[PDB]
Nucleic acid binder design. Structure first.
Length: 164
DNA sequence: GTCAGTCAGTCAGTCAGTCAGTCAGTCAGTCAGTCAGTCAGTCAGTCAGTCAGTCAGTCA
């Protein structure tokens, strides 16, 4: 889904395009099979209380992690795994945003993966980015940070994993 | 007894010598914050024993 750049849905029974389909199953059979599990055995009912069964039935959209956006501007700019990435900075309260606002600029742009190199931008090593985006590092280490999109949020997670 | 002095003690004055705070390179120390081979699981492939399928040497 990340590769084809599709935006799924959790309620539209069929997310369709000219070539592909995304199917979330019906609702009545969810209840039918879940009562079936419950009636057959009650620890199957506990499984119905286990969020794993729900994820295998309603799906984990990971929408739980904070998400917002704001018109406030940005300071830095990153490209990771072939995807641009902007770091919006809020005027007040320091609520950092990672929305995809890539303005074509001669501004400094940073990566970590060696596959990303341009005549215009800079590479970063040995934790210089920690000394460049101090506020981003702390803001994620705090509750300040907020991710605009699920793809953005995960991608930022793996970027942090690769950072160290 | 005046004129008022003109070669030693005397005090107004240093004058180079003096102490040691006080920052200060700096010192390797060091200990801790960063980073580079190490191995475990798993992926593809090598051994030499199975299956178990089959043209055929001695006979109907």
């Amino acid at each position: 889904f990340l590769f084809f750049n599709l935006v799924p849905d959790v309620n539209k029974r069929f997310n369709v395009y000219d070539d592909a389909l995304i199917e979330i199953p019906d609702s009545l059979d969810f209840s039918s099979e879940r009562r079936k599990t419950r009636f057959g055995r009650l620890i199957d009912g506990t499984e119905y209380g286990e969020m794993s069964l729900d994820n295998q039935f309603i799906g984990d959209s990971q929408v739980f992690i904070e998400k917002r956006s704001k018109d406030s501007k940005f300071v830095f700019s990153i490209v990771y795994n072939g995807f641009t990435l902007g770091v919006w900075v809020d005027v007040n309260q320091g609520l950092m945003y990672i929305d995809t606002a890539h303005d074509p600029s001669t501004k400094n742009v940073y990566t970590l993966t060696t596959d990303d190199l341009n005549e215009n931008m800079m590479l970063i090593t040995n934790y210089k980015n920690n000394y460049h985006l101090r506020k981003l590092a702390s803001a994620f280490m705090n509750g300040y940070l907020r991710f605009d999109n699920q793809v953005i949020r995960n991608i930022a997670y793996e970027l942090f994993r690769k950072m160290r």
